[PDB]
Amino acid sequence: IPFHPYYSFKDILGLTLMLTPFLTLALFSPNLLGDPENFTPANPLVTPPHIKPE
Amino acid sequence: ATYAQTLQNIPETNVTTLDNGLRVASEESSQPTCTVGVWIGAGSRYENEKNNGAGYFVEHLAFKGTKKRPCAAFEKEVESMGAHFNGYTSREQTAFYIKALSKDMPKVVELLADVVQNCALEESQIEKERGVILQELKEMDNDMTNVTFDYLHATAFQGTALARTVEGTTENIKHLTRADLASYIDTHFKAPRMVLAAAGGISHKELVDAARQHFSGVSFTYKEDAVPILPRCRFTGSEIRARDDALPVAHVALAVEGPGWADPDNVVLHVANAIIGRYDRTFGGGKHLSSRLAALAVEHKLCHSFQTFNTSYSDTGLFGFHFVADPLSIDDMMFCAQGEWMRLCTSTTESEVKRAKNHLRSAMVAQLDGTTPVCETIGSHLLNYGRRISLEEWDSRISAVDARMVRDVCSKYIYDKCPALAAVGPIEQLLDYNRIRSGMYWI
């Protein structure tokens, strides 16, 4: 089937579904997925005791 | 002696009705030869699911002899007077007519009457014709154009009676009973619904006296005098794709519900179909043809042919086009076609309608090129339009049409409408109803 309108329409719908959680997270719980340890400027002499990768 | 005048000179078509309901009409010419026939208002649309194919099976017997004059008796009598008998059966109109010497005008009417009324229906012949019709189906099935229009109706009028073929089902043909053919005749071939028409060197009066004589149907109750009104057929934006990559070319037909005989717009619709016209690989015109679609078709080898059409019916109709192409140019062709349709609704030019109107009048005239065609117009006019419509009138109506009118009317019936589609053959390239549905707007 032609990509348009079948998947162009499906894709737009898909985008809007991903968009909600992404924006909900972004607007409501901004640092949810982020480490709070990174609000402390780099200190070349001290590695945080609790250091985990993204 | 300007055209205008030759029109208002053509003798008027006379019509007289009998007490039974039969309507006799004719156009008298000096012609030594002539044509007379009975145009019944019956067809496959009147048939229901159990007898689909009766009117066609019956068509195959109205010539194999009557009660009075059996097979040879009939044929002999007719062949020997140098007359040609023949007819047809559409979805909602059936006809039987003869081509004989104006001299035999009255004996023919007798013969016509004897056919519509006393068909022998020899149960022996029936079983033979059964095998014949079955055979003609095998053949007609190889006529893409037919297959394609039947299918067109099959889906455009899906669920209704208009979605049936005239020839009927393979089962009905295999099982219809003498009795079925019998009642079909009794129920439909009835005076108030038939029309005895004639054209040529014939006296209308002589014609009607002969009518009185053999077309002496009797009517006691009101029921008999009444003409039934068929149930309305529902149009449906849909499509049916019968694919077979083994056929050489592919057929495609697209259409929208048309108004119906009665509606004046039809004139405008015809003028429009007159612009887009029709084409075919043997049209000398070539790249210079006036119809853009045709021209485009030629410049891009888009199709072996295409043709517009406005098939009218009592209450409905089909306004569309059909084209035959190669598997790989179906899309470009469809594209261009809808293109012109959209152009019809949005930008028809006065110059176009001018040409269109002329071309139309010319076709209108060719519709009356002989006693038979003329006759066919009478039988049908009365049957459809109720009365007769003179070229002087048609011509009048046609002249009223102008660009603006074409656009308005076409927009009215085309723009943003869900079309009916039928495609047959190696149709992989043409595709998606949606993509086609969007071709219905802006253009």
Swiss-Prot record, chain A:
**Membrane-crossing segments per the record:** 9-29
Subcellular location(s): the record lists: Mitochondrion inner membrane
Tree of life domain: Eukaryota
Stretch forming the signal peptide: none
Describe the protein's quaternary organization and the partners it interacts with: The cytochrome bc1 complex contains 11 subunits: 3 respiratory subunits (MT-CYB, CYC1 and UQCRFS1), 2 core proteins (UQCRC1 and UQCRC2) and 6 low-molecular weight proteins (UQCRH/QCR6, UQCRB/QCR7, UQCRQ/QCR8, UQCR10/QCR9, UQCR11/QCR10 and a cleavage product of UQCRFS1). This cytochrome bc1 complex then forms a dimer.
Q: What else is known?
A: Heme 1 (or BL or b562) is low-potential and absorbs at about 562 nm, and heme 2 (or BH or b566) is high-potential and absorbs at about 566 nm.
The UniProt entry's sequence similarity note says: Belongs to the cytochrome b family.
Function recorded in the entry: Component of the ubiquinol-cytochrome c reductase complex (complex III or cytochrome b-c1 complex) that is part of the mitochondrial respiratory chain. The b-c1 complex mediates electron transfer from ubiquinol to cytochrome c. Contributes to the generation of a proton gradient across the mitochondrial membrane that is then used for ATP synthesis.
Task: From the Swiss-Prot or TrEMBL record, give the protein name.
Answer: Cytochrome b
Organism, scientific name: Gallus gallus
**Interval of the full protein contained in this chain:** 219 to 272 of 380
